[PDB]
Structure 1
Amino acid sequence: NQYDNDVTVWSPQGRIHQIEYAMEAVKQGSATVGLKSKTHAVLVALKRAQSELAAHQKKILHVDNHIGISIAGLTADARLLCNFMRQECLDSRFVFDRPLPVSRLVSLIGSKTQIPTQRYGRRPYGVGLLIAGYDDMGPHIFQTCPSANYFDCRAMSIGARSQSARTYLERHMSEFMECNLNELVKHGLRALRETLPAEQDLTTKNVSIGIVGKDLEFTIYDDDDVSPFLEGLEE
C-alpha cells in the first residue's frame, strides 16, 4: 500500500504503480481509432455527450496542415501536449521550412512525457494519442501512452473498451492498403460501434473525423460533413 502513492517508487516486482494508474486514465474515456492506406490516413473519434442537452467534447485537434491527433484522456491535460505539438510543427516550418516528419514529432512527445515519469512530485500525462500524418515516407499512425512509450502502428484503438475495436482491425488488415478515401473511413466507423453497446448508434453529432493524405491536408469534418460518410454504411 506504500508503493502506490509516488511515481518514483518502484515495487518488489519492478512495476511503477502511478504510471500504471495513469494508464487507467486512458480507459476512462471515449474510444478512438485510426488506420492508414498507401495514401490516406484517417482518424475517427467518438465525441462523448455529458448529457443530451450539453454538447460534445472535441476529441480531434489540428496540429499542422499534414498532422492531426485524436485525444483520449484528460481533456484539459491533452491541450498541454497539443500546444507543445503545435509549437514543434511551427518551429519546423519556421526553421527548416519543411513539414515536420511525423516520426520526429512523436519522438519529441516521448521526450516530453518521459520527464514527469522520471522526477518526483510530478505526475505522468494521463492522455493517450493517435497521431495521423503524411510525409515523404508515407502516412503514419502513431500511438503514445502515459508511460511515454510510443509505437508505430498500422491501426490502433485506445480508450474505453478498445480491445474489441482492435480485434476488428486485425481481420481486415490486408484490405487497409488499397482502400480509397470513402472505404477507408468506413473501416474506422465500423470499429467505434463495436465499442459501444447496441443501445447507442452513430450520429452526425457525436462522431468527428479527420483525414490526411497525399494531395489532401488534414481537415476535420464536424457534423454535416460527417453525414455523407455515415450514409451508405449498414449497422
Structure 2
Amino acid sequence: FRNNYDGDTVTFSPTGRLFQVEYALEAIKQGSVTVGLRSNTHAVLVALKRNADELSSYQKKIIKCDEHMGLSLAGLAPDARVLSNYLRQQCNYSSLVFNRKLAVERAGHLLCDKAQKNTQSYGGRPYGVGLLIIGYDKSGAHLLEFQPSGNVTELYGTAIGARSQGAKTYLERTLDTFIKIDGNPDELIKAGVEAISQSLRDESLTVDNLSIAIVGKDTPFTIYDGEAVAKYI
C-alpha cells in the first residue's frame, strides 16, 4: 500500500492522501516543543531549545521577521531559515513599496501559498518545519500556526512539537483567563511558561534552555534568552 504512493509529492494515495506531505508533518512532531498564546494587547512565544551534547549549544527556536512580527520553529531548522527569510522579504516589500506594515493575516496567506507550490510539482519537497507566528498589526495581536501542508490557522494559543498536546490542553483549558491578560506582558509570559512546562518530561526548563519572545501594542517583537528569561523560570 503506502509504499507505492509515497515516492514523491505528485502522487495521491487511493484514499486521497499525500504521504510525502504527511512524512514532513512527522518531522515537526519529532521536533522540540514550543508554545504560542496572545491576549488583546500582546502575543507571546515560548520555546524549549534543544542541544546536542553538554559541550554544545542550544539551537535557536525563535526568529524575528520585522519590528512587529516573528515566529518560533519546530522541525528542520534550515527550512525555518528559508521561510522566515522569505517572510522578512515580504515584510520589507510592504514597507518599501506601500509604506505599510504587512498584516499577520496576510503573512499567513503568503506562507500558505509558498508552501503549497512545493506539493503539486514534480521535483519539489514539502517543507519540514512548523511555525508559530505572532505579531501586532492594525487589527491587534495575532497568532498563527503554519503546517508544511500549507494550512495556516489563527488561534488564541497553541503548541507544536514533541509532547505538545500537554501544553495545548492546558491552554485550551486556561483560555478565558489568558486571553484577557491585557496591559501586562509579564503575566502573559508566565501563562506561557506554565503552558509549555506542561509538555516537559525529560528535564526542567533552565536558563540556557528556555527562550521567550514578546510583541505588542507598544512592544517591538523582542527575544529573551538566558539570564533574560531568569525571572520566569
TM-score, normalised via structure 2 length: 0.96
Query: Following superposition of structure 1 onto structure 2, how do residues 1-235 of structure 1 map, counting pairs within 5 Å?
Result: 1-179=3-181, 180-197=184-201, 199-230=202-233
Tell me the secondary structure at the aligned position of residue 101 of structure 2.
coil
1:8-56 Cα deviation digits (max 9, x unpaired) = 1111111111111111010111011010011010111111011211011
| Counterpart secondary structure, 1:195 | coil
Residue 187 of structure 1, CA deviation: 1.2
Residues 21 and 119, structure 2, Cα contact 8 Å, conserved in 1: yes
**More displaced stretch, 137-146 vs 178-187:** 178-187
For residue 98 of structure 1, report the CA deviation from its aligned partner.
Answer: 2.0
Give the counterpart letter for 2:152 in structure 1: Y
TM-score of the two chains, using structure 1 as the length reference: 0.95
Equivalent residues of 2:193, 2:232 under 8 A apart: no
Distance in 2, matches of 1:45 and 1:189, equals: 9
Q: Distance in 2 between matches of 1:116 and 1:153?
A: 25
Q: CA deviation at 1:229?
A: 2.5
Equivalent residue number for residue 233 of structure 1: none
Count of equivalent residues: 229
Which runs of no fewer than 5 residues in structure 1 stay unpaired?
A: 231-235
Per-residue Cα deviation, 1:71-118 (whole angstroms, up to 9, x for no partner): 111011111001101101111111111211110111110111010111
Asked if the contact 2:36/2:46 (under 8 Å) is kept, the reply is yes
Which 4+ residue blocks in structure 1 deviate beyond 2 angstroms?
none
CA distance in 2, matches of 1:177, 1:44: 16
Question: Could you list the runs of 5+ residues in structure 2 that have no partner in the other structure?
Answer: none
| Secondary structure in structure 1 of the residue aligned to 2:87 | helix
Amino acid of the structure 2 residue aligned with 1:202: L
Give the fraction of aligned pairs with identical amino acids, expressed as a percent. 53
Higher strand content, 1 or 2: 2
Native 8 Å contact 2:156 2:179 kept in 1: no
Deviation at 1:178, TM superposition (A): 2.2
